[PDB]
Amino acid sequence: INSKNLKVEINTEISKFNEIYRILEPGKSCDECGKFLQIKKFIVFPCGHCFHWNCIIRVIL
Amino acid sequence: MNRFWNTKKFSLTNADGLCATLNEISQNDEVLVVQPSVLPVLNSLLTFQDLTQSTPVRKITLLDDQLSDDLPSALGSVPQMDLIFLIDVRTSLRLPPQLLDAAQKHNLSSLHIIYCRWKPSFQNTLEDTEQWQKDGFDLNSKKTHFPNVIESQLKELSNEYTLYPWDLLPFPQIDENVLLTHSLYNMENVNMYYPNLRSLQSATESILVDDMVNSLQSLIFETNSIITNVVSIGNLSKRCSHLLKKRIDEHQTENDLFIKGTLYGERTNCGLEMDLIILERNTDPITPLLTQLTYAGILDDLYEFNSGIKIKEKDMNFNYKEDKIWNDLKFLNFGSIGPQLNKLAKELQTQLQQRQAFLKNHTTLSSDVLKVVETEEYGSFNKILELELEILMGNTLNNDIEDIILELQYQYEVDQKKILRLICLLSLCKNSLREKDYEYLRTFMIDSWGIEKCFQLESLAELGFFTSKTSKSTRLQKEYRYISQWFNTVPATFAYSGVVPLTMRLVQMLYDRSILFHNYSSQQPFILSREPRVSQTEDLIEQLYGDSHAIEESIWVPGEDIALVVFLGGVTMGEIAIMKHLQKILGKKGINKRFIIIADGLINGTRIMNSIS
Numbered sequence: 001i002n003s004k005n006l007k008v009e010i011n012t013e014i015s016k017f018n019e020i021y022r023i024l025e026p027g028k029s030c031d032e033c034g035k036f037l038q039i040k041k042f043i044v045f046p047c048g049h050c051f052h053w054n055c056i057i058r059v060i061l
Numbered sequence: 062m063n064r065f066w067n068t069k070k071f072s073l074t075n076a077d078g079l080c081a082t083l084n085e086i087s088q089n090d091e092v093l094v095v096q097p098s099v100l101p102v103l104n105s106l107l108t109f110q111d112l113t114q115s116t117p118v119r120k121i122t123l124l125d126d127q128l129s130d131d132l133p134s135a136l137g138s139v140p141q142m143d144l145i146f147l148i149d150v151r152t153s154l155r156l157p158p159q160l161l162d163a164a165q166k167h168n169l170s171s172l173h174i175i176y177c178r179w180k181p182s183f184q185n186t187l188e189d190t191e192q193w194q195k196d197g198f199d200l201n202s203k204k205t206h207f208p209n210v211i212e213s214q215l216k217e218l219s220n221e222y223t224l225y226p227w228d229l230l231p232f233p234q235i236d237e238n239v240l241l242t243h244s245l246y247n248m249e250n251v252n253m254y255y256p257n258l259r260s261l262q263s264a265t266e267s268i269l270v271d272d273m274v275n276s277l278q279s280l281i282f283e284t285n286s287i288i289t290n291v292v293s294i295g296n297l298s299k300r301c302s303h304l305l306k307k308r309i310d311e312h313q314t315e316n317d318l319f320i321k322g323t324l325y326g327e328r329t330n331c332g333l334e335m336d337l338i339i340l341e342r343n344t345d346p347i348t349p350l351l352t353q354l355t356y357a358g359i360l361d362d363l364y365e366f367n368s369g370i371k372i373k374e375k376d377m378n379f380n381y382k383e384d385k386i387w388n389d390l391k392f393l394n395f396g397s398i399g400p401q402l403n404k405l406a407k408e409l410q411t412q413l414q415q416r417q418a419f420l421k422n423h424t425t426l427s428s429d430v431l432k433v434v435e436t437e438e439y440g441s442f443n444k445i446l447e448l449e450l451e452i453l454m455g456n457t458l459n460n461d462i463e464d465i466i467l468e469l470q471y472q473y474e475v476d477q478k479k480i481l482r483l484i485c486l487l488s489l490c491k492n493s494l495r496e497k498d499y500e501y502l503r504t505f506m507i508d509s510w511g512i513e514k515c516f517q518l519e520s521l522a523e524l525g526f527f528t529s530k531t532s533k534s535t536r537l538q539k540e541y542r543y544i545s546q547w548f549n550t551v552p553a554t555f556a557y558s559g560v561v562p563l564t565m566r567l568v569q570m571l572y573d574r575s576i577l578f579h580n581y582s583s584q585q586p587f588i589l590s591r592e593p594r595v596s597q598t599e600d601l602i603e604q605l606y607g608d609s610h611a612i613e614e615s616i617w618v619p620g621e622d623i624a625l626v627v628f629l630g631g632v633t634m635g636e637i638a639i640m641k642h643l644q645k646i647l648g649k650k651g652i653n654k655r656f657i658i659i660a661d662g663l664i665n666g667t668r669i670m671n672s673i674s
Contacts, residue, residue, distance in 0.1 A: 034319070035322065035326075
């Protein structure tokens with residue numbers, strides 16, 4: 001019963017999390033690269049982080 | 062201000078700095094002593110009432126040898142707190158001897174002086190807070206400099222050297238659009254470009270270009286601009302551009318090259334363009350000598366404007382920030398002033414008394430000017446116009462010129478300057494004068510106007526104004542009748558004898574080759590280019606100056622509009638009138654831009670003639 005309840009709660013949370021992102025971009029923004037967020041791409045994470053889709057691939061390399 | 066050149070905002074900073082310095086001098090009754098040359102500039106910025114109310118100073122004086130006799134009369138009297146001199150040492154690198162003799166004789170016990178300088182943007186707002194005591198005195202400024210600059214010659218009397226560096230940056234006076242920098246005269250009223258001593262031209266030219274570069278650097282760093290395209294014309298402009306580029310690339314701080322990477326940069330741009338077209342007056346000596354026909358031009362060559370924009374004979378100020386009648390009539394033609402004034406006067410009749418006083422004063426001044434145009438050697442003001450118009454198109458015959466030069470020499474009385482200017486224009490229009498006419502013209506000149514005229518005709522005969530048919534400084538060596546074919550100066554035009562200035566078409570060709578398309582054209586790289594470019598237009602300017610190197614095009618960034626058209630060698634104010642027409646017609650055609658005319662000082666025909674004398 002506990003496993004079924006946990007599975008139901010997890011499924012409900014997953015369904016709720018879909019299409020509820022509602023993340024916001026600040027007036028002017030940038031990170032890691034330093035130059036400007038709005039010049040290449042919008043790879044954005046939670047807790048307020050910004051990437052160029054290029055600096056991040058440079059980091060992993 | 063902040064990428065938007067709010068020109069009137071420049072005025073407040075200088076006044077605020079001066080007021081703060083004067084009020085921080087001492088909280089007592091002060092007496093001000095101002096240099097004769099700089100005083101008119103100060104009065105054009107701070108009014109007497111505001112000066113009295115803002116700071117406790119109550120007296121202003123002048124640097125003169127009269128003060129030496131008044132040292133026991135004026136200096137001995139008053140002196141409630143101290144004496145605060147104000148000097149200008151930006152040029153001529155020499156303090157006036159008046160203060161030197163007054164210090165030792167009257168034996169002042171407290172010497173404080175004010176010296177002017179351009180804003181040191183490199184100080185970058187005191188550089189934060191000295192980095193928390195320079196991170197443990199890791200940096201220091203004690204003895205890390207030359208002992209003194211210029212003022213090292215002041216090493217006498219006492220140690221009262223409480224110098225105070227009042228800042229100064231260009232601000233507009235004559236009109237909102239155009240600023241003005243005073244770097245064309247010394248304290249001795251000697252021209253900074255045409256000195257009357259043909260032994261030290263090179264140093265004077267170097268000093269002038271250095272000061273102009275310093276002023277441009279100050280303005281550029283104040284407005285935080287990034288020059289992208291440079292179109293240099295002439296020889297001196299090349300050195301000016303190179304020096305400016307080196308100084309910008311050397312003294313710039315950090316935290317902006319990072320912005321220089323973000324903005325502009327590689328493989329991208331943000332659509333911001335500023336142009337720095339630069340010209341020299343020696344390139345086109347054709348049109349500083351023509352007769353003015355606009356209102357302010359006519360009012361200028363008959364009554365000379367001083368450093369401040371005002372006149373001695375009248376009393377009302379011509380400042381544009383408090384009156385609107387002067388705004389709409391300054392640059393209009395003289396003929397279209399009467400009926401406009403009549404309509405303005407009659408419309409107010411149906412309809413505050415300050416407007417009535419303004420219109421009455423303007424009407425009286427216009428009537429006086431109209432009266433003085435006629436009855437004062439009647440017909441000369443028109444005869445010179447017809448003669449100039451005839452000469453510009455070209456109608457000189459064999460030896461007939463000698464008949465007309467003396468025709469108005471004594472039939473109608475006339476000043477020396479008009480004759481000298483007209484003969485200079487005659488010798489310059491044809492690009493060459495034969496060897497069989499100088500022997501008579503010079504003889505008649507030395508006959509009629511003394512012995513010293515030979516020295517004038519010799520010294521003036523090497524700058525290019527007075528040349529004979531039998532480091533080049535970019536003279537002009539092409540017949541003018543040719544230039545009337547490539548260009549359409551003689552057909553839209555005013556402020557002259559119905560002729561378009563040569564600089565006008567020179568700047569026109571950089572953006573739209575329409576008139577050049579009608580004559581001498583079978584193919585062109587473009588018809589409407591936003592960015593300034595020069596290509597396939599070399600031979601025409603190769604023969605026009607004798608060297609295919611006067612034109613310089615420089616791109617600085619690797620990859621609506623503010624154009625800075627400086628003027629090294631004065632602005633003939635008629636060009637300012639046609640600049641607005643250019644802006645309007647270009648905006649109508651599709652290209653939208655804004656022009657700011659940087660001037661080193663108003664230049665005019667007669668004002669030149671006293672210079673080379």
